[PDB]
Every structure is written in C-alpha cells, then in structure tokens.
C-alpha cells in the first residue's frame, strides 16, 4: 500500500529527513505513519527498489517548486493594498471540538460560560484550553473562584475518557451562534481620526469632554492624536522652534529612531555645523534601546503639543 | 543501492511530504 | 422512616435533585433523592479531583453535565433496585 | 516441517548464534523450538544440506536491511514534532491475564481492589505482579495488612494450578472499564504556565494564595516557575547584577552545567579578564557531579528571585 511505501521511504531517507517531512505532514498522517512504522519488521531489496522507483517517478512530475503560500500571499497583499487590507484578507481566508471551539472565542464570554459549572470542570476545561486563553479567562473570575481553580489545577490527576467525551458533548450543546464572532471595525483610533477632522472649536469642546470623562483614555487619545512620524508634514519654522525647545541628545536619539526623511528634514532645519555635529555623534555612538528612543520621542511630542497650544506651532 | 538513494535524500522535504500524502490518499 | 409527606419535604435541602419513577404495575410515582453533596463528590471523582478541597455551598441549579452525572447514577440505581 | 528446519538451523549455527536469534523471538516461539530441540536425535547430511539451501534461499529474498523500528521511529518523531508529541504518539502506538492486566493499572485502584481479599491471596497476587507495581501497592496499605503480607511473602510455598486459574478468573471478573486508564493532560506545570501568563497583580495574589494553602507544593511551584535555562532571555544588566551577586565558583559550576549559549552570554556580561580566568579555571578543573551543579544553579536562581523581587532584575 501507499502507506507502507511511504513508511519504507521514511525509514530509508534517514531520521533527519523523515523528521523534516513530518514537519510538513498533518497530525493524522504522522500518527498513521508512526503506527505503521512501529509494526515494520522486514523490507526486502525488491520492495526497497520498487519504493525508490515509484518515489522518483512521482517526484519527476513534481518537482513542483514548492512556495511558502502563506508568506508569499501576505507579502503580495501587503505590497498591493497596504497592511490593513492585507491583514483583513488574510483573516477572511483563515476563517471542531467543543474545547477547541472555546479557544476560538472571546475571553469574557467563555469565562461566564464556564463560570456556571463545577470548579473541577472549570479547571479541567482551562487545562484543556490554550494557556493564553485560560489566563485571560482566569483574570476575569472572582478571587474565590480563581483561587479554587488554581488549587484544583495544582492537584489535577487526569480525567476518564467517558467523562471527557460527555464534557465535550455538553460544551458543544451549550454553543451558540458563534460564527463570525466579534469584528474589527474601529474605535479610539477612529475616534481620534474623526476628532482630527472636526473644527478647532470642535476639538476644544473635545478636549473639554474627554478630560471630563474617565481621564485615562483621554490621555491615551492625547498621545494617539498626532504622532512623531507626522512631524515631516509640519512647516519648517515649527521644526526650528522644536529644535530650539528640544535638548540635543533627545533630538539625536529621536532622529536615530525615526526615518531618514524626517532625520534629513530636521538636519535641514538645523544649522550646518550643528547638523554635522549631530551626524558625527550619531555615527560615533552605538545602538539605543527602543524604550529610550520612544521616551525621548514622547518628550519631544509633549514639547510639540506645548508649542502648538501656545500658537507657536501649527499642526 | 546506487546514487539514486543519495539523490532521493537530497530532495526537498515538502516534495517527499506531498508524495506521501498522495500515496496515502491513493490507499 | 414512616412520616407525613410534608415532614419529609421540609428536611430536603434546597435545591435537591428529585427524580420521578413509576413502579409498574403498581399505581403511583416514586421519588429518588440525591443530595447535592453526593453529586458534587461524583463530579469531582469523575474529573480527577482528589477530594482534598472541601465542598462550597452554592445553592445553584445543576449543570447539564451534572445532570448527566446524576442520570448515570440513576440508571445503575434503577437497575439495582429493580433487581 | 518448518519448525524442524529451524531447529536444525539453530543447532548448526552455534550456541551463540542461536541465543542471539532467540533474543529476537517471542516466548511462544522460543518455547516451541526448545521443546522440539530437546527431542532431536539425528540430523542426516541430506536434511542438513536441504535446510541450509532453504535458509539461504529465504535469506536471499531478505536481506531486508532490518532497522530498529522503535528507536528510528522515536528519533524521527522527536526531531519532527518535539519530545512531547513524539512521546504522546509512541504511547498511542503502544496502547491478557488478570494479573498482567493489574500490572497495567494505577497503584491505588489495584491496592483497594486486592484489599478486599484474603491476605494470602493478596501476597500471591503481589508476587505474581511486577515488583515496582507491588511496591507501590504495598506502600498504600495499612501497617497491619502490610506487615501480614510481608510475613506471608517470606513464607510463600507455591500455589496449585487450579487455584491460580480460579484466582485469574476472579480477577478477570472483577475488572472494570479500564480501557484507556488514566490520561496525561497537565497539572502543576500547566498551573505554573498559566500563572506566568497572568498579570503582575494577579501573580501577587497567586503568591498569596499558594503560601496560604499546603505551602509545600507552593515552594515546588516557586522552584518550577522560571528555570535556570531561561536566564538567556533576560536583559544584560540583570545578568551583570547576577554576576555581582553570585560567587565566582558557583557561577563557574553553573556555566559548566549549562548550555554553551548561556555560558557565552554570561561571559559576555562579565569583564574580559574575569571571563578569561573563568574559562581557564573551567578547562583546568575536572567533571562535576550533577547534584552539585544543580545545587549551585538553585542558589543562583534564589539570588535571581531575590533580585527580581527587589526590582533590580526583570524576568
């Protein structure tokens, strides 16, 4: 049979080659081949030669020049329609057991679903669930239930297959219209974009109301509205004022972390000797951690906001 | 045991996986 | 125990699993009472629980999985009592 | 017959060759061949020549290039899908008398099963069981029953075949749905992984509750959460602080017991001269027992935890 021929091929190609092939095979195929492999006792020379001949004849046809379909498709979609459309199309293309289905669900919904269950059952399901999903679910539980689950998981001794099957059937029965669960449309960022499109008086009202509410997401939107990479679109005088109001080291670090166009714009806005000194210091220095560069850019953006509010800078 | 074994060992693992899948389907 | 029906009812913890059975050919409806503690113990044992943790009072309706556990107990109990 | 030809072949290949062949034969085949061998009185030259010719004709066909199927399959599965998936698939592939069936069961279940029996019967079953399984079962018995069984085993004189058959039949009758008994899903380690995925505040609550409970498994999880080999993923400053807070000998021993990447990372975090001295001492020293290396690594991990709690180290 073809399974026997594949088993003989895997035996005769070497452990490394067979292991590499199994990395390109599904779980069912790997399990079936391994089960067939363990029962192999003899492989005669005629059988070996026939297997080699058949495999070579099959490989003559393909010879398919295998391509990484996922990576190539992602790159094509990105370079064609941007990151957002590419990611949306990949999600559409990508889109089962009850436990596996729960792993494909929202944390709060699954948490409330299993919350109406015996704590041992909750612990068993969470063990059978993905670690990240289980951690998200447990963070939403009450302190007493969370402690009970953590205690039970620390003393988990395995479940009977019949109990596992019954639990899976119950979870399947409890399922709802989870098809196309959740949707990425917008929020916060879209609100910031809309605010940027509303009048100066309207954005004054916006500052007012956002400060009035929770305050935390208000500051988050303060940070979000306008970014450091948007400084390239500002007029030269505002950039020069920023150079005046920004320390040399912070500006140098920010330019190091920024794009060559923004760096060249800042250098042009600087004097010749100062720009040359900045370039020399950049060349003579070493790599800077991303956190430090981000902090310096945040400080520079705070200075940008301060100058813009006073009217010295136009955004 | 000629050089055919070495040539097969040098083939791409994806090709071997596809051949194995085809044989399993034909089973 | 021989007692009026209300006396038996008042001693049953709320909630409790009550199953209606008929003893054919005799006319009537029998009851099988399972305490919540026994159901919790069975669920804990069936899912690998070692029983170290004491049971917590809940006062909640039994889940469908617990319903199936109770049915699994009930079938064996029915066979035994019939025999 | 083929059995007679095989017997003649075993006689004529030599004692060592026949012994090696019996190592590749099942118990029934070895018993049958040995029974046939003991009744052999004469092997004529014609019979010998015919047996040789038939064996050579059979060996011309195979000539099968026998491979260790178990070892090769294990290596392929490991190098393909990791140790965990390989072990799971091997267990699935691998998966009888009543006594033999009891040897394939959980210690506590078998202990409670035979506990409801006469002590002499218990001793006979334990003698017929595997030594490790019997030791596990006896450890779970009460002191009186354990002492009685040990006394009875010390004076065991053999059992009648009819009694053995009746005992086997009774044990077979007492069997339950033991198919797919037990299951390796998770526990403790999975709990530690989930804790590592829960927030900093959540892990504070975790320390709290685990200390609150039994305390012993709390320390076991303290040890389990994060390992010495995970130090490679820590930032350089934390590694340098660890070098500051760790004695030279302990660090040297731990690097000797660790992987070359971690050793190179630690050497890079050290100064040039100190690293050179450490390498020279490693080369000039000799092998160190695993227990000592593990103890030094445990001390270094305790120092790591102490530094991380104080905020000087980020894990």
CA angle, A137 then A141 then A143, to 5°: 140
β-bridge partners, C31? C20
Enter the tokens of residue A201. 């008086």
| Residue linked to tokens 């792993």 | A103
Do chains C and B have 3 or more beta-carbon pairs under 8 angstroms?
no
DSSP for A158-173, written as a single string: ---HHHHHHHHHHHHH
Give the Cβ contact number of residue A98 at 10 Å: 18
Q: B3-26 burial, b if ≥16 CB within 10 A, otherwise e?
A: eeeeebeebbbbbbbbbbbebbee
Structure token pair of residue C15: 């909630």
d(CA A5, CA D173): 43
Query: Residue A26: which residues within 8 A CB-CB, separation 6 or more?
Result: none
Extract the tokens encoding D1. 């017959």
Q: Which two tokens stand for residue C37?
A: 């503690």
Q: Give the CA dihedral D261, D266, D268, D272, nearest 10 degrees.
A: -130
Question: How crowded is the C-beta side of A126, counted as CA atoms within 13 Å?
Answer: 40
> Does residue C33 sit in helix, strand or coil?
strand
Can you tell me the distance from the alpha carbon of A292 to that of D314, in angstroms, rounded to the nearest whole number?
A: 16
Distance CA A229, CA A304 (A): 12
Contact indicator for B14, A66 with CB cutoff of 8 Å: yes
Three-class DSSP category at C20: strand
- How many of the other CB atoms lie within 10 Å of CB of D47? 13
**How far is the C-alpha of C74 from the C-alpha of C31, rounded, in Å?**
11
Biggest CA pair distance of chain B: 29
Residue among A194, A157, A314, A267 at smallest CA distance from D182 = A157
Q: Look up tokens 């990425």; give the residue.
A: A184
CA distance D146 to chain A (A): 26
Q: How far apart are CA D148 and CA C66, in angstroms?
A: 42
Per-residue tokens: D45: 């030259």
B/e letters for D292-312, b = 16+ CB within 10 Å, e = fewer, are ebeebbeebbebbbebbeeee
CB–CB of A20/D80 below 8 Å?
yes
Can you read off the two tokens belonging to residue D135? 């030791």
- D75 within 8 A of A15, measured Cβ to Cβ: yes
Distance CA A255, CA A241 (A): 16
Q: After what residues is chain D interrupted, C–N > 2.5 A? A: 95
CA distance B26 to chain A (A): 7
Give rounded-to-5 percent helix, strand, coil for chain D: 75, 0, 25
Least Cα distance to D73 among B1, A30, B18 occurs for A30
Cβ contact C47–A117 (<8 Å): no
Q: Are A75 and A98 in contact (CB under 8 A)?
A: no
**Spacing of C-alpha A240 from chain mean position:** 38
Expressed in angstroms, the distance from the first to the final Cα of chain A is: 72
- List Cα–Cα distances, A7 to A1, A4, A57, D68, in angstroms: 10, 5, 17, 13
User: How many CB atoms within 10 Å of residue A90?
Assistant: 15
**CA A224, CA A221: separation in Å to the nearest integer?**
5
Task: Kindly report the backbone phi and psi dihedral angles of residue A271, in degrees, each rounded to the nearest multiple of 5, phi listed first.
Answer: -70, 165
User: Which residues in chain A have Cβ-Cβ distances shorter than 8 Å to B23?
Assistant: 1-3, 5-6, 58
Residue D148 contacts by C-beta under 8 Å, 6 or more apart in sequence? D119
Q: Measured between alpha carbons, how far is A17 from D75 in angstroms, rounded to an integer?
A: 11
Decide if A83 contacts A75 (C-beta within 8 A).
no
Q: From CA A107, how far away is CA A29, in angstroms rounded?
A: 32
C5: left (phi over 0), alpha (psi -120 to 50) or beta: alpha
Best to test chain D binding among A154, A159, A167, A289 (most D CBs inside 10 Å): A154
Interface of A with B in 41-70 (CB under 8 A): 52, 55-56, 58-59, 62-64, 66
Smallest Cα distance from A15 to chain B, Å: 11
- Return the number of other C-beta atoms located less than 10 Å from residue C24's C-beta: 7
Min distance C70 CA to chain A CA atoms (Å): 13
- In eight-state DSSP terms, residue D55 is H
Helix H or strand E encompassing D304: helix D290-309
Residue A141, judged by CB atoms within 10 A of its CB (0-12, 13-18, 19+), counts as buried
- Touch test D–A: 3 Cβ pairs or more under 8 Å: yes
Six token digits for residue D49: 């020549």
- Name the DSSP letter for residue A264: H
C45-80 as b/e: b if 16+ CB within 10 A: ebbbbeeeeeeeeeeeebbbbbebbbeebeeeeeee
- For residue C21, the 8-state DSSP code is E
Residue with tokens 């929020």: A187
Contact call for residues A166 and A173 (beta carbons, < 8 A): no
- Hey, how many other C-beta atoms are within 10 angstroms of the C-beta on D204? 9
Distance CA D247, CA B27 (A): 64
> CB of D198 within 8 A of CB of A150?
no
Paired tokens of A181: 């669960």
Taking CA D137 as the corner, what is the angle to CA D134 and CA D142, rounded to the nearest 5 degrees?
Answer: 130
What tokens were used for D270? 């050290």
Handedness of CA C42, C43, C44, C45 (dihedral sign): positive
CB spacing of A62 vs B25 below 8 angstroms? no
To one decimal place, what's the resolution in Å? 4.0
Q: What is the 3-state secondary structure (H, E, C) of D102-171?
A: HHCCCHHHHHHHHHCCCHHHHHHHHHHCCHHHHHHHHHCCCHHHHHHHHHHHCCCCCCCHHHHHHHHHHH
B20: Cα separation from own chain's centroid: 7
* Both tokens assigned to D13: 């290949």
Distance between CA atoms of residues C74 and D216, nearest Å: 40
Kindly report the CA angle at A171 between A166 and A172, in degrees rounded to 5? 95
Count of CB atoms situated within 10 Å of the CB of A164: 20
Which tokens is C70 given? 């109770």
Q: Which two tokens stand for residue D192?
A: 């530690």
Contact D12, D38 (CB under 8 A): no
Contact (Cβ atoms closer than 8 angstroms) between residue A245 and residue A303: yes
Neighbours of D166 (CB within 10 A): 11
Mutate to test the interface with A, among D194, D196, D203, D212 (most CBs of A within 10 A): D194
- Taking the C-alpha atoms of residue A234 and residue A23, their distance in angstroms, rounded to an integer, is 52
């Amino acid at each position: 049979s073809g399974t026997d021929k594949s088993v003989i091929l895997l035996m005769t190609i070497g452990e490394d080659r067979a292991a590499e092939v199994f990395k390109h095979l599904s779980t069912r195929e790997v399990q079936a081949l391994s089960t067939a492999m363990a029962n192999v006792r003899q492989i005669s020379n005629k059988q070996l030669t026939d297997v080699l001949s058949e495999f070579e004849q099959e490989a003559e046809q393909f010879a398919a020049l295998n391509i990484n379909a996922n990576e190539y498709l992602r790159s094509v979609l990105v370079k064609a329609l941007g990151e957002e459309r590419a990611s949306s199309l990949l999600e559409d293309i990508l889109e089962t057991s009850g436990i596996e289905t729960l792993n494909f669900m929202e944390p709060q919904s699954a948490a409330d679903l299993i919350r109406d269950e015996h704590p041992q059952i909750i612990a068993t399901i969470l063990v059978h669930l993905k670690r990240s999903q289980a951690a998200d679910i447990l963070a939403l539980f009450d302190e007493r239930l969370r402690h009970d689950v953590m205690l039970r998981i620390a003393t988990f001794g395995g479940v009977q297959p019949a109990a596992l099957a019954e639990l899976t059937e119950v979870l399947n029965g409890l399922l709802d219209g989870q098809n196309l669960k959740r949707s990425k449309m917008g929020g916060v960022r879209t609100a910031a974009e809309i605010i940027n499109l509303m009048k100066t008086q309207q954005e004054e009202a916006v500052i007012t109301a956002v400060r009035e509410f929770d305050g935390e997401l208000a500051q988050k939107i303060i940070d979000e509205m306008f970014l450091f990479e948007n400084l390239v679109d500002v007029d030269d005088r505002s950039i020069q004022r920023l150079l005046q109001e920004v320390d040399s080291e912070s500006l140098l670090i920010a330019l190091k972390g920024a794009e060559p166009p923004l760096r060249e714009k800042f250098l042009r806005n600087m004097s010749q000797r100062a720009a040359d000194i900045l370039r020399d210091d950049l060349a003579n220095r070493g790599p800077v951690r991303l956190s430090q560069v981000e902090n310096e850019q945040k400080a520079i953006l705070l200075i940008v906001r301060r100058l813009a509010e006073t009217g010295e800078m136009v955004i | 045991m000629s050089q055919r074994i070495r040539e097969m060992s040098d083939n791409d693992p994806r090709v071997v996986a596809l051949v194995i899948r085809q044989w399993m389907s034909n089973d | 125990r021989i007692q009026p029906y209300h006396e038996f009812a008042r001693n049953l913890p709320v909630p409790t699993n009550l199953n209606l059975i008929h003893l054919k050919p005799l006319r009537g409806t029998g009851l099988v009472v399972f305490s919540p503690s026994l159901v919790f113990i069975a669920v804990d044992n069936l899912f690998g629980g070692d029983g170290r943790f004491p049971t917590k009072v809940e006062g909640r309706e039994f889940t469908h999985t617990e319903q199936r556990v109770i049915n699994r107990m009930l079938k064996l109990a029915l066979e035994g009592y019939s025999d």
